[PDB]
């Protein structure tokens, strides 16, 4: 549970940031 | 630069983990 | 302007399939 | 397997395009 991950790239973060927020919303909307 | 990103999930993390390692490889092939 | 992309792989396509469905549902929330 | 997906997003497509080319390059080195 919970796996910290650091990346030297703000660009990749923006991507993973959208995938993380988009993946969490699917669970709340889908259940 | 280094931006932390708490990823809770084996698949989700594996995604950003594979995307991070895959993105770094492109730099070697491209420049 | 549609850009057909022949995804080679069940996992690869499944990935973009989840990113496409999540990006489409997320866009509805914004505008 | 070869799947066919139609992406109506310039940015979204570029993502899967970079993810498919990056995931295909890493798979070639292993497989």
Curated annotation (Swiss-Prot), chains A, B, C, D:
Upregulation details from the record are:
Up-regulated in response to DNA damage. Isoform 2 is not induced in tumor cells in response to stress.
What results from changing residue 10 to L? In a sporadic cancer; somatic mutation
Please list where the region (Interaction with HIPK2) is annotated. Answer: 1-31
Per the UniProt entry, the effect of residue 22 to T is: In sporadic cancers; somatic mutation
Outcome reported for the amino acid change (mutating residue 2 to S): In a sporadic cancer; somatic mutation
Q: Which domain of life is it from?
A: Eukaryota
Q: What is known of its domains?
A: The N-terminal and C-terminal disordered regions undergo liquid-liquid phase separation (LLPS) following homotetramerization and activation. Post-translational modifications, such as phosphorylation or lactylation affect the ability to undergo LLPS.
Query: This chain belongs to which protein, by name?
Result: Cellular tumor antigen p53
**Source organism:** Homo sapiens (Human)
Question: What gene is this protein a product of?
Answer: TP53
- Write the span of the intact protein that is present: 326 to 356 of 393
């Amino acid at each position: 549970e919970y796996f910290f991950l650091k990346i030297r790239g703000r660009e990749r973060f923006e991507m993973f940031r959208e995938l993380n927020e988009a993946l969490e919303l699917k669970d709340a909307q889908a259940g």
